[PDB]
Amino acid sequence: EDNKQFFGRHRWVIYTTEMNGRDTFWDVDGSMVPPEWHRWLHCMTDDPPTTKPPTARKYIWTNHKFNVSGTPQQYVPYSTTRKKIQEWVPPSTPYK
C-alpha cells in the first residue's frame, strides 16, 4: 500500500508464483485473493488482516480455491433431492 497514490491505486497485491499446484508466474488471476485480504484490498475497509484478523470458525476453509472453471474441478449442477415415486418391485417368485 502507498497512501500518496490517488484512491484506487493506493493498495495493490503482487500475486504469488504458485498456488494449489498451478503455476501463476505468468498466469495471475483476479480470484487468487483470500477472503480476509479481499476485504482490505477492495477498499471495503481499512484494517489489514494482520492487524485485525477475521473471527475463526470451524467451517471456514483453510485453503482458498481460485476460479475452478475449465479445469477438471468444476461445479456440475445436479439434483440434491431424492426420488419421488417408488416403482413397485416385481416378485421374483416364479408364481403359479
Partner: protein
C-alpha cells in the same frame, strides 16, 4: 501515481485554469472506509401510548 512544477505550469497554462486546486483524482480527502457504527433514529410513530393505528 502531484507532478513537477514545470509540468504544473505547462499543464495549467495549456488548460487555462488552476488545475492543482480541484483535481479529478481523490487522494486523501475521501472519507475513511472504516466508519464508526451509526445510531439510526426512530419514526414519529415509535410511541408507547396514544399511537393507535386507527388514527
Amino acid at each position: 501515481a502531484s507532478a513537477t512544477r514545470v509540468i504544473q505550469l505547462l499543464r495549467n497554462w495549456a488548460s487555462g485554469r488552476d488545475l492543482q486546486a480541484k483535481l479529478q483524482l481523490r487522494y486523501q480527502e475521501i472519507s475513511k472506509r472504516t466508519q464508526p457504527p451509526p445510531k439510526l433514529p426512530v419514526g414519529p410513530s415509535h410511541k408507547l401510548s396514544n399511537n393507535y393505528y386507527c388514527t
